[PDB]
Symmetry: D2
Subunit: 140 residues, 4 copies
């Protein structure tokens, strides 16, 4: 029951394509919608166009969209990005805190965190879903 | 609205059992409630039905109820489908305007998870076939 | 039926555009045809709409047509839904009895891919949003 | 590619069972073949596991085989996964490059259906949980 709405989020690390290290708590104070995906996962990639459109649509608002590849190694991820260009800042993560503190066994996975850095939904709806817009608006 | 956020109170609505008797969502206050809103022509809905039944089996004796609620426009195709496909769980049907107007049920499949307190856990809950619904349900008990 | 296997001839049906003019599937013979059968209150159908529109745009000028066919019981919600949601591809609607009785379309969403000769490629085709549909379509072109 | 169109010959690949015995897809020529290519961390993949198993039961004794093929990069999580979740069909694992290369399979879940001549029916078959897969299989078993 650590992951239920209202419970605090759990930090993890992520690398960007250049090498900078960011941690989830850097975005403390914004609404955070996280997309976990991987290059060989069809249903994950099917959601990318909608996650990107959300990014564009809320550019002017206090929410951060984190796309985090969980590919085992970095190279299929970078190889994938070279062929499939993206507008949001891309992250990559094989942080053990994802598996052991977030208990993430499967992807796709979507998470919505509110401004106080509390979980709103540990199991958030997909970015292509009709309701995510209102869910997101509600949270702002 | 902000009224469907986690921690907000569930909204009651009326449904009908296969015998044409009224029931209310409120009758279940005190249990964890997982609702499956579905319809006979909806492939994905009908795809989850095996998993929703198996959840009912798997959690027999825990304080949760599984409500399969048809949103078919008329009861006729619902009862026809049920004659040709038997189910362990008690089946319900609803056309209550409150589904569209208080729960913003514009589309199906729609899954909803409500807590023993009759508060929303997730108004857009994961699907019955997912690993995630198990873990989430385990967490609310 | 064995009538829907790849390489078997497609089955014609009637549909209406927004202005009530009639067309038939067979009018498009000679092109690759990708059909999206959907309805206004089908969540997963409408979630594919952006991708289906993106394919139509991506393949403009190539020898393929994209047919968005609403199977809504009546015309009205279809038309209202379109007023709110402007789509680029020409929209159709159909209650032709053949959909159910020849194509065995019992459930939506449903996607169908037909080749230039008007034979079935895949009567249960991948979804518009999938990576798999583009490679499929290119295969066929 | 054009080589994965219905009616084209299927493409062999090597796979291993939980004991390390080797089998090749082409060994099954003569039977309809429905392949489920999945991995332990792909949620949508294992969402289909029950239905795939239900189908192997529904069609026991008929001229079709059901092949669940883990594409996990390593065998350990696969083996660990089956440990804790029991399964009636014989389980297989593959990392044959023929998958990516010749079958041009870049994403899972992925399902393939092959006819008794070892020709492709659908390289992109419906999911096991779907209502149509059973109509499709039956349609292939009659022909
Ligand atoms: Cl949640």
């Amino acid at each position: 029951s650590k992951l239920l709405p209202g419970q605090p989020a759990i930090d993890f690390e992520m690398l960007d394509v250049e090498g900078n290290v960011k941690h989830l708590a850097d975005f403390k104070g914004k609404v955070i919608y996280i997309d976990l995906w991987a290059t060989w996962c069809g249903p994950c990639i099917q959601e990318s166009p909608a996650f990107e459109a959300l990014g564009k649509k809320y550019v002017g608002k206090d929410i951060v969209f984190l796309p985090v590849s969980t590919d085992t190694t970095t190279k299929p991820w970078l190889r994938y990005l070279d062929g499939h260009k993206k507008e949001l800042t891309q992250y990559h993560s094989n942080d053990v805190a994802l598996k052991e503190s977030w208990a993430i066994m499967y992807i796709p996975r979507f998470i919505l965190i509110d401004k106080d850095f509390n979980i709103v939904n540990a199991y958030a709806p997909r970015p292509s879903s009709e309701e995510i817009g209102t869910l997101i608006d509600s949270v702002l």
